[PDB]
Amino acid sequence: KKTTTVGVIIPDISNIFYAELARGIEDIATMYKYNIILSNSDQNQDKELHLLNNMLGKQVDGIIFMSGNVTEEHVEELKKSPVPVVLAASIESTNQIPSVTIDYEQAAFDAVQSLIDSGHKNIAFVSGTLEEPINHAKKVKGYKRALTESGLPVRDSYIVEGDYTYDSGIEAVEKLLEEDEKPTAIFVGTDEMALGVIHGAQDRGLNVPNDLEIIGFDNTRLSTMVRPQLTSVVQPMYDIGAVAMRLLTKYMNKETVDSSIVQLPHRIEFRQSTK
Amino acid sequence: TTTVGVIIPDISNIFYAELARGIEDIATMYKYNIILSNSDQNQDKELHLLNNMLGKQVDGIIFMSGNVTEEHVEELKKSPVPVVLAASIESTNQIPSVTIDYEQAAFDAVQSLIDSGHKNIAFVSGTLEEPINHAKKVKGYKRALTESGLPVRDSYIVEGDYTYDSGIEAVEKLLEEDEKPTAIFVGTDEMALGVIHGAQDRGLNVPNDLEIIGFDNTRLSTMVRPQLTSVVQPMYDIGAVAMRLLTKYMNKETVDSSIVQLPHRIEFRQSTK
Ligand SMILES: O=S(=O)(O)CCNc1ccccc1
């Protein structure tokens, strides 16, 4: 009888993928007939860790926690949690907290592989804050794997760190176009920077995809809000939401989880940003 | 342990997120907790989100909605905690609120267009059923047109649904018109982007073949080629301000300015020749 309420925390208002996913979670939650409280942490552990105390105080029965750096410190406070909490689209390398994500490493590799097969030999990578695991530990690595496996060179200058803003993407293409030999394809860590990559390349006079093929990531709304429409790695937001809910529900009902660390499949939605 | 809840219709929408940014900033300044609720502008969900918020003992509420009905103010009057409407219109002004003159901002927009010698100017609006539209933006678009002696063409007023897609559709429709618009004023930036693309996709050039003026001036305004000329309604300020106004109430302070109205302007970019 007691209406169940789940807490959802996203790292920020910037990266629209998180917000969209939160929305995806809320959707699935509505059918369970659950309540949803959404908090924003601006990715500073403190607020994240306190939110874990603001969510209980606000009597939520469970939490879907999103984050770009679930440090071992997080893990500790987490395990101690009163209410069940599971991660959504967040790597937590120790595998000690229930989580559901896609295999980012494979996504990145498939994406660049995609371009290898198009005939590109020197492909650059514009990523997000390197300090975050999804980047330095998965996306950078799936990118490098793709190149080295195809016997391509791995230049340091071909991997540029941005800060998830559309502007960082622009500056990223400029730095890259100031390179000895330019890249013919650039894989970008998220759609918004990607949109910035397209644009900067388009303002310098380059044509997408005829001169520079670009693939983005997350497959957010921005994906189809550009010309040429952005082909992008798909991280199935509803799959994430659904799995995370049954998982969290099982927990709330004090059931058992045979698979606590679930990894959902991924695909690449191909559009006009690639030949 | 102060904590305020806020009801917007969609945090994932870059538009409502910029507002959330100011809400959140004054929030951390005052060391305050924030809780968001997504409405999807669905009335039934608004009432619900309102009850849930009260049920969670929030000390204040920032509310934003496409249509603040009369039943809304009624139930919103029963609130034991201060409620301040952000970027939402409600004529009676009996619920404090911070906004901008939407009728004037709209007018100014289509007006700039008139100046550049535009005669057949259209309007890609959102759900007309919404007050901000039928009673403010649409109105002002008709005023600029008439005060300047222009043919207010009923088929030059297309209703989209705030999605980037309806803006694409609306262009195609406007292009199917016997008399093609020489320019288009769009209600939101998201639809504006849709308008620019639809046009370009049919082979047209902005601003040389079609000038387009958006409204909101979100970051989406700079994420298009050509860059969108848009009416500025500083969502971040509205929200920062809405929080400070709410805070006074919550702390039982004085508010000699119950309904605040921030100023507006037009950011001209390359969407306007
Ligand atoms: O996730 S799948 O099982 O593949 C399709 C699920 N549809 C669904 C089921 C229960 C709740 C919400 C959505």
Curated annotation (Swiss-Prot), chain A:
Coiled coil residues, start to end: none
Keyword vocabulary terms for this entry: Activator, DNA-binding, Repressor, Transcription, Transcription regulation
Record bears the keyword Transcription regulation: yes
Highest taxon in the source lineage: Bacteria
Single GO MF annotation: transcription cis-regulatory region binding
General function of this protein: Global transcriptional regulator of carbon catabolite repression (CCR) and carbon catabolite activation (CCA), which ensures optimal energy usage under diverse conditions.
Official protein name in the record: Catabolite control protein A
Organism: Priestia megaterium
Phylogenetic placement of the source organism: Bacteria, Bacillati, Bacillota, Bacilli, Bacillales
Residues of the full protein shown: 58 to 332 of 332
